[PDB]
Write a protein that binds this ligand. Sequence first.
Ligand SMILES: CC(=O)N[C@H]1[C@@H](OP(=O)(O)OP(=O)(O)OC[C@H]2O[C@@H](n3ccc(=O)[nH]c3=O)[C@H](O)[C@@H]2O)O[C@H](CO)[C@@H](O)[C@@H]1O[C@H](C)C(=O)N[C@@H](C)C(=O)O
Ligand SMILES: [Mg+2]
Length: 446
Amino acid sequence: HHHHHMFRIVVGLGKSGMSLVRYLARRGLPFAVVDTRENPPELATLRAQYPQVEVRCGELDAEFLCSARELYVSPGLSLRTPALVQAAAKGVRISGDIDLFAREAKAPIVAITGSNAKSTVTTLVGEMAVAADKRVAVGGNLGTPALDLLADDIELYVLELSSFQLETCDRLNAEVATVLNVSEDHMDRYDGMADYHLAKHRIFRGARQVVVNRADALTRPLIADTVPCWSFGLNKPDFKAFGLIEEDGQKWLAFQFDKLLPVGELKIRGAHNYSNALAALALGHAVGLPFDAMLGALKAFSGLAHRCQWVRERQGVSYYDDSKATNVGAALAAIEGLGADIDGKLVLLAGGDGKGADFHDLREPVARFCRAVVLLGRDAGLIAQALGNAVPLVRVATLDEAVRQAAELAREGDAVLLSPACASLDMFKNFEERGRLFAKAVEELA
Ligand SMILES: CC(=O)N[C@H]1[C@@H](OP(=O)(O)OP(=O)(O)OC[C@H]2O[C@@H](n3ccc(=O)[nH]c3=O)[C@H](O)[C@@H]2O)O[C@H](CO)[C@@H](O)[C@@H]1O[C@H](C)C(=O)N[C@@H](C)C(=O)O
Ligand SMILES: [Mg+2]
């Protein structure tokens, strides 16, 4: 079983695996593809587009993996998979598409992770860079695989990174890096908060600057003492800091003692979105984006689909798609934020794959803001146990039923909120499909 000394193996045939196939094939390197599943989602794609690439589907063959110089592992595949552990112990480098991107990119990287907000802040910094007339490429976990962004004329890369991707990134060497926030998530993969936190802090390896959340200690890296450190927060900022300046009850986004923009001139609203705006300003300022360009993009920014997104108002009841809420921290923010905005109470739709999360933090906000909760999905029962008898709970089987029942529970002035605190993967392809099907059911109400 001979192989070339450059031989490498792509482990996982999903979207990032296909970006690795494209990259390695373009460089004419010897490689093969494996996947633990008999019928991975991009198998048909690989067979149609790369009929000559060796592909092995099923139980991983550790002896085959051990013949490669490096494995590029799908971020969704746990590195505790036994054959990967065995290859690692025999000195095979465990890598991945972000690790490879970091080793190849020829322009500064803005690297953004966090338990929440990383897609919004990544998108915003990208729009700031476009407004600053930079040749920018934006992607990563956000959707466009990072390797597909590579081009020599790119002046700035903006990457959303997951804790999973970061586990195989040896030395990202970002120009500026941030962990926006950390709250319990992905506890079906990590043993606890310590390993989850450590994985995210790999974003700082080699970072030339950092952006830190003054309100979240799990975002503060050791290197904040040795590289330029820009902080954001909602309190009044000090030197080198972004924050809010308040005068006669009017709030301004601010850098040090300079008022930048009244928060009322943003389209996005609420404390979490102000924090996101300040984080994006800090990241953009770190890579030289002019303030006037950044503020113009901030004023124009409308937010992302499935982020507490208004769908419909029917019989005085408004319907909001917050399907992006796949952890408790996100649902907490939406319940508090929308609950405080409306002239009524919430009917919350929640449940799905809870990833081993503690749901106890939902109880008090649900008791304060909800008229009822509609629960679906694999871990509906765990959520119901955490909520107790705070409010009426209605158990349903499908999202269409959940919407029909929520309409019946709601009264004029209420809002129906899909903010599930769970992954969608037990019942849906992804959280975007979950949100699209919620919006479809809402639109089908008579
Ligand atoms: C799960 C994950 O990390 N997905 C990211 C990945 O998409 P990709 O299609 O390559 O997925 P993947 O890494 O193959 O994982 C998908 C699923 O396949 C399974 N899988 C994968 C390989 C394999 O051999 N066997 C197997 O069972 C994984 O366990 C997982 O359940 O690469 C894309 C490009 O970088 C990302 O946009 C996408 O992020 C999505 C948005 C996501 O859900 N990310 C998670 C981490 C999140 O945000 O929490
Ligand atoms: Mg995640």
